[PDB]
Amino acid sequence: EDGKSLENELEVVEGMQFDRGYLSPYFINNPDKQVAVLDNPYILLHDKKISNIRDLLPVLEQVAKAGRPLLIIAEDVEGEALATLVVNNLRGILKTCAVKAPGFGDRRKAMLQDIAILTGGTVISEEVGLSLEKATLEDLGQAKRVEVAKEHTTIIDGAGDPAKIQARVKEIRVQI
Amino acid sequence: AAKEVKFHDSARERLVAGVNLLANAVKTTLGPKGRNVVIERSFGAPIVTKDGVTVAKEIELKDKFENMGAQMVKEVASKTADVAGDGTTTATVLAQAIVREGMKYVAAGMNPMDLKRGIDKAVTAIVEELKAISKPCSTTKEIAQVGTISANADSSIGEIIAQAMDKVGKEGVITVEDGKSLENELEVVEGMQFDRGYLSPYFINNPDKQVAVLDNPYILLHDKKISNIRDLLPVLEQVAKAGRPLLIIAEDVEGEALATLVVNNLRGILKTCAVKAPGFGDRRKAMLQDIAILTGGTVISEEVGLSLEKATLEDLGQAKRVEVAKEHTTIIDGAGDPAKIQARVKEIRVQIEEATSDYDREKLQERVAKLAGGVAVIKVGAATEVEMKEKKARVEDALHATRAAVEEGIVPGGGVALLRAREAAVAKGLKGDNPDQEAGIKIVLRAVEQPLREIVANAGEEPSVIVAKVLEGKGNYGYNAATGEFGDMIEMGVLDPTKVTRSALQNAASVAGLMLTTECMIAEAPKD
Amino acid sequence: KLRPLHDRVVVKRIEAERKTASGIVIPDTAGEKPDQGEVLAVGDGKILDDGSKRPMAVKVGDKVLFGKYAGQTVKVEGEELLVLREDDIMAVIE
Amino acid sequence: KLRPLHDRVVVKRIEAERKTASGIVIPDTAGEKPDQGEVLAVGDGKILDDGSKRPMAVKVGDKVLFGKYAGQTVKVEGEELLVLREDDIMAVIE
Numbered sequence: 001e002d003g004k005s006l007e008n009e010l011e012v013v014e015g016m017q018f019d020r021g022y023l024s025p026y027f028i029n030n031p032d033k034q035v036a037v038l039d040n041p042y043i044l045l046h047d048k049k050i051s052n053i054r055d056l057l058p059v060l061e062q063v064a065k066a067g068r069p070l071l072i073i074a075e076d077v078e079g080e081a082l083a084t085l086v087v088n089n090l091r092g093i094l095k096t097c098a099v100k101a102p103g104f105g106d107r108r109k110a111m112l113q114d115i116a117i118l119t120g121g122t123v124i125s126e127e128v129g130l131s132l133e134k135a136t137l138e139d140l141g142q143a144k145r146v147e148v149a150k151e152h153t154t155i156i157d158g159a160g161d162p163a164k165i166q167a168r169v170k171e172i173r174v175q176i
Numbered sequence: 177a178a179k180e181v182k183f184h185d186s187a188r189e190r191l192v193a194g195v196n197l198l199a200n201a202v203k204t205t206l207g208p209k210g211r212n213v214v215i216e217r218s219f220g221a222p223i224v225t226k227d228g229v230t231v232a233k234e235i236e237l238k239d240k241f242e243n244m245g246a247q248m249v250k251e252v253a254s255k256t257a258d259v260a261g262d263g264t265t266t267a268t269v270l271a272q273a274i275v276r277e278g279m280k281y282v283a284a285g286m287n288p289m290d291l292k293r294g295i296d297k298a299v300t301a302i303v304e305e306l307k308a309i310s311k312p313c314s315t316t317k318e319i320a321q322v323g324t325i326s327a328n329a330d331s332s333i334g335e336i337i338a339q340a341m342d343k344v345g346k347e348g349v350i351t352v353e354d355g356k357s358l359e360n361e362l363e364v365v366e367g368m369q370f371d372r373g374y375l376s377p378y379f380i381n382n383p384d385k386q387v388a389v390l391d392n393p394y395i396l397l398h399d400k401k402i403s404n405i406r407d408l409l410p411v412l413e414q415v416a417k418a419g420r421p422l423l424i425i426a427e428d429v430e431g432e433a434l435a436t437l438v439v440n441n442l443r444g445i446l447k448t449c450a451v452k453a454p455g456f457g458d459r460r461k462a463m464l465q466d467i468a469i470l471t472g473g474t475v476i477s478e479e480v481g482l483s484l485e486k487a488t489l490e491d492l493g494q495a496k497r498v499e500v501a502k503e504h505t506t507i508i509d510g511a512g513d514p515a516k517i518q519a520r521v522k523e524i525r526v527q528i529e530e531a532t533s534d535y536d537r538e539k540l541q542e543r544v545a546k547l548a549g550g551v552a553v554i555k556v557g558a559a560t561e562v563e564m565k566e567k568k569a570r571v572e573d574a575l576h577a578t579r580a581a582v583e584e585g586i587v588p589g590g591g592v593a594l595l596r597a598r599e600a601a602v603a604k605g606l607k608g609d610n611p612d613q614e615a616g617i618k619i620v621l622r623a624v625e626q627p628l629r630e631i632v633a634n635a636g637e638e639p640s641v642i643v644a645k646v647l648e649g650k651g652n653y654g655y656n657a658a659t660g661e662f663g664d665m666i667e668m669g670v671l672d673p674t675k676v677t678r679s680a681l682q683n684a685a686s687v688a689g690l691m692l693t694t695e696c697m698i699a700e701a702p703k704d
Numbered sequence: 705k706l707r708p709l710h711d712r713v714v715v716k717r718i719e720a721e722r723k724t725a726s727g728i729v730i731p732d733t734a735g736e737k738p739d740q741g742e743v744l745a746v747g748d749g750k751i752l753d754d755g756s757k758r759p760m761a762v763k764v765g766d767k768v769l770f771g772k773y774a775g776q777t778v779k780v781e782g783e784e785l786l787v788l789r790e791d792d793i794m795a796v797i798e
Numbered sequence: 799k800l801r802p803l804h805d806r807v808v809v810k811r812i813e814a815e816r817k818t819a820s821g822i823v824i825p826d827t828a829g830e831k832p833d834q835g836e837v838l839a840v841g842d843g844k845i846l847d848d849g850s851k852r853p854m855a856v857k858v859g860d861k862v863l864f865g866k867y868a869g870q871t872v873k874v875e876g877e878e879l880l881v882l883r884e885d886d887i888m889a890v891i892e
């Protein structure tokens with residue numbers, strides 16, 4: 001890509017980064033860089049838009065028990081659902097961040113599955129047989145750290161076992 | 177379509193001819209004794225300009241092979257204007273000098289790729305010497321001198337720009353617009369002004385100026401339209417018994433809500449004013465949050481959990497004074513904690529480093545100026561529109577140079593800085609890896625004399641005699657083309673931003689170095 | 705202050721819950737308005753066809769559950785109070 | 799906790815069928831909502847025109863089948879309790 005300086009520079013991105021930012025500035029936990037750092041968070045994979053509170057409340061309550069942050073990866077989090085997150089963030093009751101699901105069309109589904117495999121979770125969707133109301137902590141993905149910037153988030157390392165990750169990599173390279 | 181292909185010298189002469197035609201037109205505007213160029217516009221009123229980039233961008237040649245040389249040199253000035261805003265004529269002059277000197281070595285059978293490598297090596301050495309020669313621009317007198325030189329020896333423009341930077345500080349924003357009088361005037365806007373007027377003339381409390389002044393008012397930030405009264409009543413009652421005025425900043429206040437505010441204004445029960453929320457889209461949200469931080473309040477919005485019915489006085493922002501005119505209001509001083517304001521400014525300047533559109537940081541800088549600075553407006557005064565445009569370009573050029581002066585420092589003007597940097601680089605042991613690279617170095621060493629030569633040539637003197645005398649001197653010793661006298665450039669006021677000089681040399685070398693390496697040129701064939 | 709007539713019952717609809725079991729704060733906009741409330745004033749009873757009054761199943765003080773369709777808000781001295789017939793209250797809590 | 803009034807009956811709508819006689823698993827979205835449920839609380843009885851109470855045909859504990867257009871959900875302690883009149887129950891199972 002084009003550089004801004006007069007010298008060549010190399011930028012290396014490690015782990016999973018899907019170039020999608022947060023939906024609300026209040027998710028930022030440190031104003032020094034304007035980033036949302038989540039330490040040992042749960043990752044919720046959803047292939048459908050989230051607007052109401054009555055469906056996301058059952059899973060938001062479960063992550064409050066352990067106290068770990070929650071990263072919500074869905075098509076969109078607006079209205080009551082987005083509101084409920086920011087009220088909890090400012091009051092400090094439960095720290096969380098929400099990002100848009102990366103990719104368009106079937107590519108969004110494929111990369112969402114890759115994140116679930118990497119993070120050791122499952123994509124909650126009615127097309128497979130899982131409901132957001134019945135989603136549990138075991139169905140949620142995990143990571144040791146994730147940071148959400150203005151236009152991108154990087155999952156530092158997924159919690160999935162390397163065996164399934166290698167198998168997923170093998171499937172994609174076969175499809176290549 | 178069909179392509180015509182030129183090779184070897186036949187291609188190079190066409191390329192050089194296009195370089196010379198564009199650079200000769202730009203040459204005429206260089207220096208204090210440079211003259212103007214008239215460019216005809218399709219819609220009439222030809223523009224009279226002394227800017228190199230303006231002249232270069234309008235040059236297109238019938239010969240398509242000569243046009244490539246013009247187009248490639250044209251974007252030397254375009255890049256210099258983008259990164260420095262000044263020195264576009266110097267960059268164009270330097271680029272032509274490199275091409276002229278480099279074509280002699282190309283015609284001598286030297287490898288042009290090694291010439292380009294030698295050119296890059298010499299330019300890197302000279303730029304480093306420019307950094308050492310450069311001195312910081314601390315005094316406001318130097319700022320006036322830098323502005324005066326860049327405004328073509330106009331002390332009024334230099335002085336007004338120095339005053340503007342003094343008033344708004346380093347974090348302020350200065351803009352240039354047309355004036356109504358014949359003299360330049362400076363208007364400084366302090367605090368936060370968001371160029372939005374009142375929604376009803378009855379909000380005016382003093383008819384002398386047709387303005388609405390609220391002393392120690394509450395500020396209600398709302399990100400949604402207000403139309404009914406039942407939601408505004410709970411907060412209006414809280415404002416009422418306190419006695420302070422209320423300023424309602426929302427998307428719109430119409431219907432029952434607007435009538436209730438107007439009714440209470442005439443009856444004197446509760447003094448208030450309502451203004452539209454500034455900005456469109458997400459930018460409206462951004463400055464609304466900035467106003468809330470500045471005024472020490474919170475923007476009421478259901479997207480954050482706050483409700484207008486449940487809004488309290490603590491959620492409302494405060495200020496010492498606000499005045500609402502027909503088309504703008506100014507918050508004289510917000511009541512927010514300065515630590516939070518500084519943190520907010522830090523966040524925006526971080527976003528400034530990431531801005532990708534030209535209007536992106538421009539509005540971001542405006543937000544910073546509204547928060548922790550000021551906005552200065554220079555109204556250029558001229559008798560006619562043609563003179564107004566020429567003066568505005570000179571004021572804009574002087575603004576760019578003064579900004580570059582505080583950013584990176586100042587160097588002696590009149591091409592002296594490049595000559596001093598060249599001598600320091602040579603004395604430091606500037607050498608190439610092979611004789612072809614040594615020739616590339618010699619190209620740059622001769623080329624950096626060209627800005628002084630063309631300044632002197634425009635002044636009517638002998639360039640080679642003046643250059644030799646300047647090289648005999650040391651330090652800031654130079655030649656004043658305005659007065660035709662030798663002396664200290666800094667003492668005589670001939671100052672240049674080191675960023676402008678460095679950018680002009682680097683941009684010229686990058687393009688002219690590539691032009692030396694051309695052996696084949698491909699263009700669309702003429703239509704018979 | 706307000707005296708209902710016949711089968712009318714005046715209820716103050718309770719505030720929509722703000723905290724949760726784990727303490728999660730729901731914004732007032734998101735919180736669904738509950739269909740419950742306590743009774744402040746009770747009527748004498750509907751006049752049945754043979755005369756006299758029907759004994760009322762709700763006394764002033766209990767918490768009652770009512771349908772969302774029924775009821776009307778009254779503007780007296782600011783508070784929102786719902787006045788509705790006795791048949792719409794489908795249950796009494798504790 | 800919940801005490802219905804007059805002809806009202808409180809029913810917990812039983813969940814959708816999950817495993818069949820062949821063990822086929824149906825997703826909760828696909829599974830149709832049954833019109834059955836057990837009764838937790840029963841009203842005293844509808845006051846007929848001459849006073850007194852109408853004897854109730856539903857006693858607390860049995861499984862009742864009720865119309866899918868009838869009943870209203872109550873938000874108490876998060877359960878899917880449904881409150882409906884005595885006449886909407888089509889039948890009583892076992």
Ligand SMILES: Nc1ncnc2c1ncn2[C@@H]1O[C@H](COP(=O)(O)OP(=O)(O)O)[C@@H](O)[C@H]1O
Pocket residue numbers: 205206207208210226227228262263264265266267325326588589590591631655656657658659670671672
């Ligand atoms: N009085 C002066 N004596 C000598 N050199 C001058 C004088 N005034 C300006 N200059 C030089 O002329 C150059 C200004 O060129 P100008 O015509 O403004 O085009 P550009 O801004 O594109 O270089 C500066 O580098 C400056 O050093």
Ligand SMILES: [Mg+2]
Pocket residue numbers: 262263325326573
């Ligand atoms: Mg200039």
